[PDB]
Amino acid sequence: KSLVGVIMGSTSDWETMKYACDILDELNIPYEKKVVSAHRTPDYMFEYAETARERGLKVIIAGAGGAAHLPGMVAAKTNLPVIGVPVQSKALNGLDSLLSIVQMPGGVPVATVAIGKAGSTNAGLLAAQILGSFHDDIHDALELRREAIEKDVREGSELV
Amino acid sequence: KSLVGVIMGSTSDWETMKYACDILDELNIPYEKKVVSAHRTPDYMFEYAETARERGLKVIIAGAGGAAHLPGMVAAKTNLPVIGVPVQSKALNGLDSLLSIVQMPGGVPVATVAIGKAGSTNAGLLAAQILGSFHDDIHDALELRREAIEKDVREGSELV
Numbered sequence: 001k002s003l004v005g006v007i008m009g010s011t012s013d014w015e016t017m018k019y020a021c022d023i024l025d026e027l028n029i030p031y032e033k034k035v036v037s038a039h040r041t042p043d044y045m046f047e048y049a050e051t052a053r054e055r056g057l058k059v060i061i062a063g064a065g066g067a068a069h070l071p072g073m074v075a076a077k078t079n080l081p082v083i084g085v086p087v088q089s090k091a092l093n094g095l096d097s098l099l100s101i102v103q104m105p106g107g108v109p110v111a112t113v114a115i116g117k118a119g120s121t122n123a124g125l126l127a128a129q130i131l132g133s134f135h136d137d138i139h140d141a142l143e144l145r146r147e148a149i150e151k152d153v154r155e156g157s158e159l160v
Numbered sequence: 161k162s163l164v165g166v167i168m169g170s171t172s173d174w175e176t177m178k179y180a181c182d183i184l185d186e187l188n189i190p191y192e193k194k195v196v197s198a199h200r201t202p203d204y205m206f207e208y209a210e211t212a213r214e215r216g217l218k219v220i221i222a223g224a225g226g227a228a229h230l231p232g233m234v235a236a237k238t239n240l241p242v243i244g245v246p247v248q249s250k251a252l253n254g255l256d257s258l259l260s261i262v263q264m265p266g267g268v269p270v271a272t273v274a275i276g277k278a279g280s281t282n283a284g285l286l287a288a289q290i291l292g293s294f295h296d297d298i299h300d301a302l303e304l305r306r307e308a309i310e311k312d313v314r315e316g317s318e319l320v
Contacts, residue, residue, distance in 0.1 A: 019266075053299075058293045059293065079289055079292060079299055079302040079303055079306065080289065080293065081271075081286060081289040081290050081293060083271070098258075098262065102258065102262065102272055102273065102274055102275075103274045103275070103278075104273070104274055104278070104282060105274075105278050106179075106277070106278045106281035106282055106285075107281070107282070107285065107306065107309060108282070108285075109273055109282035109283070109285045109286035109289065110273075110282075111241075111243070111271030111272070111273070111286055112262055112271070112272040112273065113262065113264070113269055113270075113271070113272065114262055114263045114264055114265070115262075115263070117266070118263075118264070118265050118266045119264075121266035121267070122264060122266060122267070122268070122269035122270075123269070125267065125268075125269050126241060126269035126271055129239055129240065129241045129269065130241050130290050130293055131293070132239060133218045133219065133240065133241065133290060133291075133293075133294065134218075134293070134294035139213075139239055142239040143239055146239065146267065149267060
């Protein structure tokens, strides 16, 4: 049973959103991934969000660029934590994506991460952290993962 | 036993961070509030972050402005979810705060919310949502709060 839903407005955002999914896979967290568009499939977006809780999801990761409304509108329709990944847009390099996602009004939080693939990775990790707040096995896995990277960086980053 | 830690670098940030605490008070979620500075008390910041999980905290809300490093450095030191509130800075109106918080690299997510008061309110709600991913009573209270606001706004839609 999926614990995290990873959604995005278009297939073109997949190369960004796959980073989140890779993290979930690495950590063996069950998830689903779907294209759900705020602007092209608005009714479907509402159905997806409003039924997430009953479907067993605990966290939603939503990616969008430009006038990026997907994370906020999903957030307006569920009280699951919603993590917003600003996709890097062509003209404004994700500045529009960022402001469109992060500047939510009081009452409807969206947990916003960095523009692009770094943010996407981080959305997966943040979802895992949210689960880890109550599943010690996931928290332990996150700790070990971080420890392993710390060692790799401190001990195996030779400069020539 | 506090479930949320609400921290900020300066007593002057309280004007912003109070809003997150008002939400927690409203939802009867036990929390602690402290002045922890990334730049003025860096050792204390590491100790606070390191010991949060042991102490029973499940989420940390951190507010900072300007070259805002508090949320990110706390996040580097704990696998609890960390919510970053960008405080509105004087010269750049929180643009510096926002970018210095949200643009975290892969491996160390910070759940970033809006600049200022709206963001602070939302950090409290987001922490509650994170708790609500395990605690059905908190999730239900969030749903009820939102439903009452919906009614106040909808059965109040007339501009007279």
